[PDB]
Structures are given as structure tokens and as C-alpha cells.
Write an enzyme that holds these catalytic residues in place. Structure first.
Site, PDB file in Angstrom:
ATOM      1  N   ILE D  83      32.661   4.781  26.989  1.00  0.00           N
ATOM      2  CA  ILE D  83      32.779   4.565  25.687  1.00  0.00           C
ATOM      3  C   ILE D  83      31.376   5.059  25.148  1.00  0.00           C
ATOM      4  O   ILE D  83      30.315   4.925  25.711  1.00  0.00           O
ATOM      5  CB  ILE D  83      32.882   3.020  25.171  1.00  0.00           C
ATOM      6  CG1 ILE D  83      33.982   2.610  26.011  1.00  0.00           C
ATOM      7  CG2 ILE D  83      33.284   3.124  23.842  1.00  0.00           C
ATOM      8  CD1 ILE D  83      35.312   2.984  26.005  1.00  0.00           C
ATOM      9  N   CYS D  84      31.428   6.023  24.227  1.00  0.00           N
ATOM     10  CA  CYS D  84      30.331   6.468  23.426  1.00  0.00           C
ATOM     11  C   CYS D  84      30.243   5.799  22.055  1.00  0.00           C
ATOM     12  O   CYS D  84      30.919   6.208  21.029  1.00  0.00           O
ATOM     13  CB  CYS D  84      30.646   7.996  23.118  1.00  0.00           C
ATOM     14  SG  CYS D  84      29.878   9.170  24.473  1.00  0.00           S
ATOM     15  N   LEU D  85      29.469   4.661  21.882  1.00  0.00           N
ATOM     16  CA  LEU D  85      29.239   3.935  20.629  1.00  0.00           C
ATOM     17  C   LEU D  85      27.772   3.767  20.430  1.00  0.00           C
ATOM     18  O   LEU D  85      27.179   3.636  21.495  1.00  0.00           O
ATOM     19  CB  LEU D  85      30.194   2.657  20.905  1.00  0.00           C
ATOM     20  CG  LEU D  85      29.971   1.586  19.801  1.00  0.00           C
ATOM     21  CD1 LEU D  85      30.551   2.363  18.394  1.00  0.00           C
ATOM     22  CD2 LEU D  85      30.691   0.337  19.825  1.00  0.00           C
TER      23      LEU D  85
END
Lengths: 71, 314, 637, 146, 73
Positions: D83-85
């Protein structure tokens, strides 16, 4: 004892169960209260799907437990 | 190494307490600095943070380079030229050992050693044909990398473990000699037996026979010829009959043969140095290789390593 | 025994010592220590009072330990001057670290880091720390955050981050604990800078005052102000943090304290931009690239002030090659100015947004206050744009245009009501004049092939002119397409004495189109835009002009016979008539009721009989010869 | 970190968000399995998505490692589950809670970040054709999430 | 009277209770001092769990007696 069952796609209800009752019995009670057959009911609790062959004691489901329904 | 502002400030404040020590080893001339570091043997305090020793290390790293470049051990990437198998003068050997042994001692009595940044000086000095320098460099390298297997990650500031050239050189060093051999008579001989009179040195170890593929270049030297010729003479002989790429490998085998050619005091000392270098190389390669890689590369090729190691520690 | 002997006091007293605070490391360990103290309070409710009392006592005592530890700006040995004075000067080229690091080396620095980490841990506990608002007024809590004479890097430090977390927690729990106090602190700090904010705009304040202690004093003031502004923008006033209670608090503050804050912020941004421009005009280019403030830890660079490089910014490693005392002083100055400008721009955007963030319903008083804030902000922006001539100030004008574009947009669509007030005050006419002047200047450029290869923005006159023209044209275009304007309701929300209710956005779209088309026609009359036999305009400018034409020839479903000036005091029920009635003596409620019943009509005669004889005489005396100033008026061409 | 994970789980249990649920895996409180229901008026609406959460030994001082076990279509989500958060990469603070992370992920599901994506192909197809992105997301959810 | 509760994953806490107090009151006080909901709480004394319906006197828990707290899912 009493248990809490929130329908993510619908309304919330309360039921009465026993520790030895299988998840299939819970789904049957859900059908009786609502109508949707167990095969279509999806039961979730603690982030894990509940299996018909199992039971509350195996899942360690306690009183006032809140479960989620997906239909 | 890169430190966050708070970490850098904390390290600077900590090092401020070591200022008298730093001035002790930095305000003196080179001979006095050497004679002072050689006097630091035992630690009477908890393991110092290696950061506070950065001024000293750099100084040492400054001197070692002057010796690495003097003999041209510094491999120049701009030139494909190899490194000539030229021995170091005894004076220079002692000069370098005085600092390498102190580096070993310091790395043993310190933590947070990821700040250690010399790195390439050890790589250059590893090319030295003299085996005492090889032993010292291998010892320092083995003490390092042990952290890199204990943690397996984290910034290290030298990262010399990645290079494949160093891996190949270390594997060659670890395979020098064999932990066990089958003499002509058929009786097992392990290197531990070198320290007991119940056996004789195998004749295989007493003679030099090196072969390299370019068409096959061979160098053969009998026991008598090895006794007559000096180690530098043997290096010169081999250098004239082999390609550059193989020289390093030859420099090991020849040094082994000359070690076992005769049972003289110097030869015995060289034997001990070679065995210690082999053990340190085994220790290092055990830290820069996956277990299956180590088994496929070293232990399968040298099955009797574990038994010799266990026999040597009593 | 613990309660009587006061061991809880000892649990905190050691935080006032630099050695212990540094040992605690002010991170993770100190947060764990704070959480442990909170758990100790929880386990023994009997000890909660003692723990809170000790915490408040140490907070009160901490400011007394601050002192002038050292100095951060040093005069150059060669000329005893802090900053450069000519682009051809020489550099001493010392071997010191390129960027100074003072905060963590100060006793108060590490002390505050550790103490704020402890407070953050206690807040994480969510236990006893909730009771610090009692018996500790925020006026004393802020006394440690905003210390006198902090380093230039204070606003970017672990102490400020922990303080931000703690203040966010307190604001979420106690909404009105500290907001008013911090706003008062900011206003007082801006007032203290009256000498620096009101200096002449034709020259650099610092370079003019170089070599004097005034430079150090002003820089310390600016560092404190930068810390204050960072706290204000990160905690209280942010588009993400704009809650209904927050907006009501802002309205109350501006109602009961005046609008001097808006003017002071305008002056701050104006003077910071002018100082950046002038300073950049006296340093060698190598120092200019060596002291760029953009790579701050957590700024991200987006938004104003615009950065005008000299070397391409996609190369990197441009900082640290050369250093010197003057270089470090310049770096500190530029960092402080950049942070001040960025925070001021964020504050102005938040002020122009206000209630429209939530679309919450507003009473008459709240709507009037909001429109008053809009009017003040827009008039200040217009004054800022008008202040400086366009010749020789191209970097400053570019920064100003970027700031105007950023402020009048929502994270983008134009803010329709602030833009309407901008137009009513002559802002768009000023933009049109600037565009025409920049076009005439562009026609003078020797060659245009280079202008089409704009990988980045330089200080060259041609590229700066192109950037300014493109920014102005983009702002004009964004105000002509209904797709990129906030859809605010019709003017009926504000006035009742109007000829016809019209949608504000669509109604505004018309005059902008008229002005743009007139400008294009005038440019054509000069035989510049068209009729030319050569490519005398870069591709971007002509694309913007084509977009302007396309928008101008787009249709909108309104007619817009005329537009009415939007005034805060004229919003129905107008505050002017109510104030006149109060001056007469009638209560405000009765005046509002009468105005609502009579449909915004003055009482010509006392037949209604709600004016007393003397009240009637005073009413007739105080009306004035002109009764047109009590109703909305059409906006002139 | 145990004292923190205990209260996090207690907060989830007391007032769990109807949008998502989570709990320990095999009684290993550092390993959690979480369930997310597709946000309303979104291509993923009506689906069920499973996530695995690993809590670092220095939690909450370091972000938890959250991975999408279930295959999903999104510019910022890779098929491997990474995930790219922002809150999990740079904007992490100890004040944040796992429930807040789940809510942020649910919001991101219907609010992608094409300008800073993880898999370029999904972001490019999103920018070029919103309807095609919605269609492919719907098909993927039906294939796997349902 | 005063009793002690040992958290196997933390420190020890003290509770002011009476023999007639039911296990539910003890669970509520443990939640107050720690924050764990009573249903998540499992109490152990002398190797045997405790039923919420019974009282301390039923289980023979006296002054200074130390219970153990564990959590089960």
C-alpha cells in the site's frame, strides 16, 4: 444469551444463542429473522469469516458480541 | 553514516567528553602516534561508541593508503592493469601491523561500529602478497560483517560485502590448504596433526603445482627448488608464466608450498599464519553467504572443516 | 509517604537540567516515560492531583531557565558585514559545515525537546493530562513554546512537532483553551515588528541596516514569528482543521479584536518577498544556489512563495559545495523568509475560505463578519499588488502573482465571493493592465526560441516576463469558465433591495469576458497579437490567449444587466441603517424587525410613531444629505 | 507496545466501525487480519477485502505494515498487497490509531491518488478513461472481492 | 480490604474491595484501573478461573490475596 448482529448492507438486530450453537444455527436464526437463506449470508467477526461447521465456542464468541452481515 | 539532527547532536556531545583522548592520539607525530596506539591493549571502561574514535580511524586510514599506494596495491578502476605480486618491506609490514592490530582491538571494544568507513583500505591491502597483512585484514573483515549477520540489515557505511571480487578473494583464501588430505600412504592427515609428531606432512603440500586455463599455463616447483628460491623469487617466476587474472590465486598456492617446503622456524610461522588466515576467511565467508551458498561453495568442497575447527579449540 | 514527601515533584524536577533531558533523548524513550507517568496517575487516582500540580509547576518554572546561550549571526571578518552587497564579491570559503545546526546544541533546545516529548506521551495516555487546562492558563503554556530569541531552525524541530501534537490534542478536547491566546501572541509579535514591516519598500531592510545589532534583533523576532506562524497554521487555522467551532472562533476574534492582523500579515508577506528579491540581487549566483531554502524537512515546496532558481533544480547536490559566514547568514535569512511567506499565504487562503469549507448556515452577524473579513483580505491583496511598479521588480511581481493565484483558489476552483470582491475593487483591471504591460515588454525580447524551452524558472528577464504573463493569463482564464469557479448562490442571499436576483458566479463571468475581449481587441489594434508576419509570441502565451478566446465565446444562461457592489454593512438587514437607529436610540432588535417588515425602506415620516420626538429630530438630523449610501449601488464600468 | 495494542483493540471492540473489522491472528496480537467493505458509490462497493497487519516491536513509534491480501484494482495498490499511503510512509505519528488507518484506507479506496501512484498502468488508464477504470475495478471486485 | 491483581503483560495493581463484592465489581474496577472491558477479562486464582456470578468469599479470596489477569480470544 444475547448477541448483536449488524447488517452492513441493512439494519441491526439482536438474537439469542448458546455457546455450543454452530454458525449454521446462527445463520438459520438470521434467515428466520430476515429471510435470506444461510447460503447467501456472509458472517464476519474480528476480521475473519465465520464457517458453518464451526461454533461460537471454537470462535470464542462471547456475550454481547457484535458480528457483521454481508448479503 | 547519516544521523538525524538529534542523534548527531547527542553523538557530538558524547564525543566532547573524549577530547583529551583524541588530543592524546592526534596532537602527536606519526611515530609517537603509532607507539601510543600500540600501548592501548586492555579496555578499563565500557565499550566506547566507535563514533568518538572517528578522528583516530581517519588518521590511520590516511597512513594505510600511503602504504597501499606506495606498493600500488590500490587497484585503479580507470586502468585494467592488475597488481604486481611484490612483497612489502619488513619495516612497512610492522608499520601497517601496528595499526591493523589496533583496529582489531578497537573494533572488539566498541559498539555502533557502522560508522567505520575505511572499508576500501582493507580491500586494497588484501592484495598484499605478504601473508601477515592478509591475516590482519582478514581478521578485521571477519570482526566486521559479524555485525552485518547479527543485524542482517541497517546502514553499514562500507558495504564491502556486496562486491563479488572480495567474495572471490575470500573464498580463495578460505580454500587455501585442505582441512583433511589423503597422503600417499593412504593415512588421513588433518592440519591439526601439524602440531603433533605422530604424523608426517603429506608430500602433496611440499610441492607446488599450479594450473590455470587461458592453452593451459602450468607452474611446477619441487620441494628442493622451493627451498632454494625465496618467496619473492617464486612470485616473480609465476608472474612471468601466468596471466594477470590468476596471479592472486598463485600468490596463495606458492605461499602455501614455500610454507610446507621445509620445517624451519620461518616456515612454521608462515604455516601458522596461513592456517589462521584460512580460519578467518571461513568465518568471514560464513557471514556474507547464505547457508546453502556456503555449503555449496566451501563446506562441500572442504567437508572436514567442522571437525578440524572442533579439534583446534580444546 | 510518596504523597507527603513529594516524590512526584522529583519525577519532573530533573527535566529542567540539560544533562538529564539530553540523556532522555527526547524521543521514544521520553514518550514512554510520559506514558508511564500517565499510567502511574491512572493506577493511583489519589496521585492524579499531585502529578498535575507537579507538571504545572515545572511548566511555570521552565521559562526562568532560558538564557541567551550564544549568537547565530556572525559578522564577516573581512568587512564586518553579515550579508553580501555585490554580485561580484568574493567568498572566504571556510571549511565549516555548510548548514549550521544550533537548536539541538542548546541547553534549552534539548530541554524543550525532552519536555515536549514527555508531554506528548502524557497526552497519548489521555488520562491526567486532560486536567492541565485547569490551574494552568494557556498564557503560561505558550510561554515555553514561543521563547525569546530562538534559532532559525526552531520552527523545524522535534520540540515543535511534539508541541503541535499536544496542542492538537488540547484543541480537540478543549476547543477554546488556547486559540485566542495564540492569536493574541501572534498579533503582538507582528506589532513588535512594526519597524521592520513599515520600512521603505524601495530597498532591503537588512542590507540597509547591515553591520548593526538591529539585524540580530530583527532576525530573532522573525524566528520567533516563524515558530508562531508554523504552530498557528499546523494546529488551528488549516483547511483540514476548519471546523464549525473554529470558524465561529475566528469570527469572534475578528469581531472583538479588529482587522489589524490582516494588514500586519499583508505587510509581513510583502516585506519578506521584497527582502528575498533584494537580497538575491546582491549575492553571487553561486551563493544564491547554495542558500536556496526550499529543501526544508516537511514543507513539500508546493504553494507560494515561488522559487526562482539559477541552475536546473533536477540536478541536485547543489548545496554544500561552498560555505562561509556570509553564506550561512544568508541561508538562515532566506529560510526564515520562505517559511514566513508560506505560512502567511496559507493563512490568507484559509481566511478567504472560512465558512464555505462546511457550507454551514450563518446568522446575519456571522455572514456580515465573514464578508468583512473577505473585504479586508481582498483590499489588502489589491494594495499589495498596487504598491510596487512592474519595472525591475519582476521576481517580486512573479511571487505576488503566484500568491494571488494560490490565495484565490480551492485545493483548483476559484473562490467565487472573494473573486467577486476582488473584481469590485478593481483587481481584474489591475491584472489587465499588468498583462498589457508584460505583453509590450515581451515584444521587446530579442529572441523567443529560448522561451519555448523552459525546463525551469530562472532570473533572466525574458523567462520571468513569460512566467508572469502566463500566470496572469491563467488567473484570468480561471475566472471565465464556470467549470472552475465555486458555485455560490445568487445575490439574493445578501441583498433584498436589488432589481433582479442573479447567480453570483455566472453574473461575475460576464464583466471578466468583456474586459478580456476589449484587451484582445486593443492588442490587435497594435498589430501585435495578429496581423504579424513572424512568430512574435511564445507557444504558451498564444495557447492561453486561444483559451481566453474560447471562453469568451462560450455561452452562459444569464443576462446580467448590472452588478451590485458587495458591502458587509449593506447585507440585509444593513448594518448602516441599524447603526443609525442605535445612534437615534432605538434598540437593534426593533430596528431589524421594522426593516424586515418594511422591506428595507427608510421611515420617511414618523406616522408609524416608533420614533420619539427628540429621537425623530436626531434621526432627521443624522440621516445626511445623501440617502443613496444605505443601499447597494451598481458597479461602474 | 503491548499496552498500546491492547487499548487499540479495546477501542475497536467498544465502538467498531461498521465499514471495517479486524482482530488478532492465531492469538498473535502483533499479527492482525482486517476486513474492509467497499465504499458506497464506488466501483468496489459491496465487496469484501482482507488485509494483513504486522505491528513493529517499537509500535506505535513506527508505522504498521499493512498489506492487501486480496487482489484489488487501484492506482496506489499493487497486486502483491503493498500500500502507498501517506500516514503509513511519512505522516505517521504515535497519536494515530489502527481504526484511523482503516478509515483512511477506506476513504482512499474511493479517493485514489493518481498523481503519486504505485502501479503506473492503473493510474494511466484512470487518467485517460475514468469509465474504463470504473469498469475494470468493478470486474476485478466481482472476480475476487465477491 | 485490599487485594492485588498481577497483569501477566505488565505491572501489579491494587483494588479496594470487600468479601461480599461480586466478581463483576472486581472486573469493573480492573477496567477502571486498566481499561480492559470486563468481557475480555479472565481472572485466575490458585489455578482456577472465576465466575462472574460468584463472590470473593465464595472463592476464599482474602486480604492481600493476589489474582492473575489473562486475556482470551
Amino acid at each position: 444469551m444475547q448477541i448483536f448482529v449488524k447488517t452492513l448492507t441493512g439494519k441491526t438486530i439482536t438474537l439469542e444463542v448458546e455457546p455450543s450453537d454452530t454458525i449454521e444455527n446462527v445463520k438459520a436464526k438470521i434467515q428466520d429473522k430476515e429471510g435470506i437463506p444461510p447460503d447467501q449470508q456472509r458472517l464476519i467477526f474480528a476480521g475473519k469469516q465465520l464457517e458453518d461447521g464451526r461454533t461460537l465456542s471454537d470462535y470464542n464468541i462471547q456475550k454481547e458480541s457484535t458480528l457483521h452481515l454481508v448479503l | 553514516v547519516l544521523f538525524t539532527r538529534c542523534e548527531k547532536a547527542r553523538k557530538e556531545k558524547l564525543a566532547a567528553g573524549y577530547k583529551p583522548l583524541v588530543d592524546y592520539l592526534i596532537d602527536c607525530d606519526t611515530p609517537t602516534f603509532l607507539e601510543r596506539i600500540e600501548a592501548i591493549q586492555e579496555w578499563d571502561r565500557s565499550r566506547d561508541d566507535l563514533y568518538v574514535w572517528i578522528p583516530i580511524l581517519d588518521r590511520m586510514d590516511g597512513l594505510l593508503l600511503k602504504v597501499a599506494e606506495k606498493y600500488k596495491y590500490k587497484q585503479d578502476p580507470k586502468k585494467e592493469c592488475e597488481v604486481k605480486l611484490v612483497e612489502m618491506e619488513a619495516h612497512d609490514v610492522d608499520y601497517c601491523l601496528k595499526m591493523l592490530k589496533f583496529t582489531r582491538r578497537l573494533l572488539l571494544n566498541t559498539e555502533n561500529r557502522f560508522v567505520y568507513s575505511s572499508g576500501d583500505v582493507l580491500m586494497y591491502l588484501l592484495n598484499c602478497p605478504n601473508f601477515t597483512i592478509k591475516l590482519a585484514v582478514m581478521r578485521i573483515l571477519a570482526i566486521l560483517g559479524e555485525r552485518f549477520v547479527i543485524a542482517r540489515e541497517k546502514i553499514v557505511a562500507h558495504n564491502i560485502f556486496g562486491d563479488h571480487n572480495l567474495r572471490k578473494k575470500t573464498l580463495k583464501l578460505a580454500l587455501s590448504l585442505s582441512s583433511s588430505v589423503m597422503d600417499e600412504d593412504g593415512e588421513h592427515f588433518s592440519l591439526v596433526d601439524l602440531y603433533f609428531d605422530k604424523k608426517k606432512v603429506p608430500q602433496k603440500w611440499r610441492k607446488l603445482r599450479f594450473t590455470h586455463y587461458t592453452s593451459i599455463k602450468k607452474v611446477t616447483m619441487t620441494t628442493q627448488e622451493l627451498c632454494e628460491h625465496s618467496l619473492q623469487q617464486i612470485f616473480d617466476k609465476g608472474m612471468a608464466l601466468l596471466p594477470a587474472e590468476s596471479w592472486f590465486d598463485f600468490s596463495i598456492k606458492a605461499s602455501v608450498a614455500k610454507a610446507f617446503s621445509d620445517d624451519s622456524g620461518e616456515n612454521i610461522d608462515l604455516r601458522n599464519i596461513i592456517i589462521e588466515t584460512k580460519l578467518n576467511a571461513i568465518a568471514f565467508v560464513n557471514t556474507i553467504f547464505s547457508p546453502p551458498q556456503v555449503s555449496s561453495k566451501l563446506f562441500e568442497l572442504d567437508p572436514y572443516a567442522f571437525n578440524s575447527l572442533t579439534d583446534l579449540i580444546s | 509517604q510518596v504523597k507527603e514527601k513529594g516524590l512526584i515533584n522529583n519525577l519532573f524536577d530533573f527535566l529542567l537540567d540539560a544533562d538529564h533531558a539530553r540523556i532522555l533523548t527526547g524521543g521514544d524513550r521520553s514518550t514512554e516515560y510520559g506514558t508511564d507517568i500517565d499510567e502511574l496517575a491512572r493506577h493511583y487516582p489519589d496521585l492524579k492531583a499531585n502529578i498535575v500540580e507537579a507538571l504545572c509547576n515545572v511548566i511555570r518554572k521552565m521559562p526562568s531557565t532560558f538564557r541567551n546561550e550564544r549568537e547565530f549571526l556572525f559578522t564577516s571578518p573581512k568587512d564586518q558585514k553579515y550579508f553580501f552587497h555585490r554580485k561580484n564579491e568574493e567568498i572566504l570559503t571556510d571549511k565549516e559545515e555548510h548548514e549550521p545546526a544550533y537548536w539541538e546544541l542548546l541547553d534549552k533546545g534539548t530541554m524543550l525537546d525532552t519536555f515536549t516529548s514527555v508531554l506528548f506521551g502524557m497526552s497519548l495516555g489521555n488520562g491526567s493530562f486532560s486536567q492541565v487546562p485547569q490551574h494552568l492558563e494557556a498564557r503560561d503554556f505558550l510561554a515555553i513554546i514561543f521563547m525569546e530569541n530562538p534559532p532559525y531552525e526552531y520552527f523545524t524541530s522535534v520540540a515543535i512537532s511534539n508541541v503541535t501534537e499536544v496542542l492538537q490534542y488540547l484543541d480537540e478536547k478543549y476547543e477554546d483553551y488556547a486559540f485566542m491566546d495564540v492569536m493574541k501572541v501572534l498579533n503582538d509579535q507582528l506589532e513588535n515588528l512594526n519597524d521592520f514591516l513599515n520600512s521603505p519598500n524601495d530597498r532591503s531592510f537588512f542590507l540597509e541596516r547591515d553591520g548593526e545589532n538591529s539585524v540580530r534583533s530583527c532576525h530573532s523576532k522573525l524566528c520567533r514569528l516563524a515558530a508562531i506562524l508554523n504552530i498557528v497554521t499546523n494546529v488551528y487555522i488549516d483547511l483540514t482543521t476548519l471546523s464549525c467551532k473554529r470558524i465561529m472562533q475566528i469570527y469572534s476574534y475578528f469581531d472583538k479584536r479588529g482587522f489589524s492582523l490582516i494588514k500586519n500579515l499583508k505587510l509581513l508577506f510583502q516585506k519578506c518577498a521584497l527582502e528575498e528579491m533584494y537580497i538575491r540581487q546582491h549575492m553571487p549566483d553561486s551563493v544564491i544556489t547554495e542558500t536556496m531554502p526550499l529543501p526544508i524537512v516537511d514543507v513539500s515546496g508546493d504553494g507560494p512563495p515561488l522559487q526562482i532558481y539559477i541552475d536546473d533544480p533536477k540536478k541536485g547536490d547543489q548545496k554544500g559545495k561552498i560555505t562561509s559566514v556570509k553564506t550561512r547568514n544568508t541561508l538562515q535569512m532566506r529560510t526564515i523568509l520562505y517559511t514566513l511567506q508560506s505560512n502567511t499565504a496559507i493563512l490568507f487562503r484559509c481566511f478567504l475560505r472560512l465558512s464555505h469549507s462546511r457550507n454551514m448556515d450563518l446568522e446575519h452577524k456571522d455572514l456580515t463578519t465573514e464578508v468583512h473579513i473577505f473585504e479586508n483580505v481582498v483590499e489588502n491583496v489589491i494594495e499589495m499588488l498596487k504598491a510596487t511598479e512592474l519595472e525591475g521588480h519582476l521576481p517580486y511581481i512573479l511571487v505576488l502573482l503566484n500568491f494571488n493565484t494560490f490565495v484565490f483558489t480551492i485545493p483548483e476552483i476559484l473562490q467565487t465571493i472573494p473573486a467577486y470582491i476582488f473584481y469590485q475593487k478593481g483587481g481584474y483591471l489591475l491584472y489587465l493592465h499588468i498583462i498589457r504591460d508584460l505583453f509590450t515588454r515581451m515584444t521587446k525580447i530579442k529572441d523567443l526560441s529560448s522561451l519555448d524551452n523552459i525546463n525551469y524558472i530562472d532570473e533572466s528577464n525574458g523567462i520571468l516576463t513569460l512566467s508572469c504573463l502566463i500566470n496572469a493569463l491563467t488567473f484570468y482564464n480561471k475566472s471565465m469558465q464556470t467549470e472552475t469557479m465555486e458555485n455560490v448562490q445568487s445575490i439574493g442571499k445578501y441583498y433584498v433591495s436589488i432589481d433582479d436576483d442573479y447567480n453570483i458566479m455566472k453574473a461575475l463571468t460576464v464583466p471578466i469576458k468583456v474586459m478580456a475581449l476589449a484587451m484582445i481587441l486593443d492588442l490587435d489594434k497594435s498589430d501585435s497579437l495578429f496581423k504579424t508576419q513572424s512568430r512574435n509570441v511564445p507557444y504558451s502565451v498564444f495557447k492561453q490567449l486561444l483559451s481566453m478566446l474560447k471562453n469568451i465565446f462560450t455561452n452562459v444562461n444569464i443576462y446580467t444587466k448590472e452588478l451590485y457592489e458587495l458591502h458587509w454593512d449593506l447585507i440585509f438587514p444593513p448594518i448602516k441603517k441599524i447603526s443609525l437607529f442605535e445612534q437615534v436610540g432605538i434598540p437593534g432588535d426593533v430596528a431589524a424587525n421594522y426593516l424586515t417588515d418594511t422591506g428595507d425602506d427608510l421611515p420617511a415620516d414618523n406616522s408609524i410613531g416608533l420614533f420619539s420626538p427628540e429621537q425623530w429630530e436626531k434621526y432627521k438630523k443624522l440621516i445626511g444629505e445623501d440617502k443613496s449610501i444605505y443601499y447597494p449601488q451598481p458597479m461602474q464600468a | 507496545a503491548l499496552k498500546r495494542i491492547h487499548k487499540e483493540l479495546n477501542d475497536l471492540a467498544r465502538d467498531p466501525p461498521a465499514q471495517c473489522s479486524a482482530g488478532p491472528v492465531g492469538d498473535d496480537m502483533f499479527h492482525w487480519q482486517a476486513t474492509i467493505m467497499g465504499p458506497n458509490d464506488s466501483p468496489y462497493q459491496g465487496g469484501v477485502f482482507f488485509l494483513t497487519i504486522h505491528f513493529p516491536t517499537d509500535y506505535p513509534f513506527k508505522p504498521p505494515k499493512v498489506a492487501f491480501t486480496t487482489r484489488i484494482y487501484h492506482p496506489n495498490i499493487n497486486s502483491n498487497g503493498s500500500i502507498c499511503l501517506d500516514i503509513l510512509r511519512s505522516q505517521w505519528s504515535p497519536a494515530l490509531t489502527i481504526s484511523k488507518v482503516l478509515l483512511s484506507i477506506c476513504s482512499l479506496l474511493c479517493d485514489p491518488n493518481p498523481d503519486d501512484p504505485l502501479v503506473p498502468e492503473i493510474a494511466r488508464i484512470y487518467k485517460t478513461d475514468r469509465e474504463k477504470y470504473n469498469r475494470i475495478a468493478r470486474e476485478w471486485t466481482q472476480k475476487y472481492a465477491m
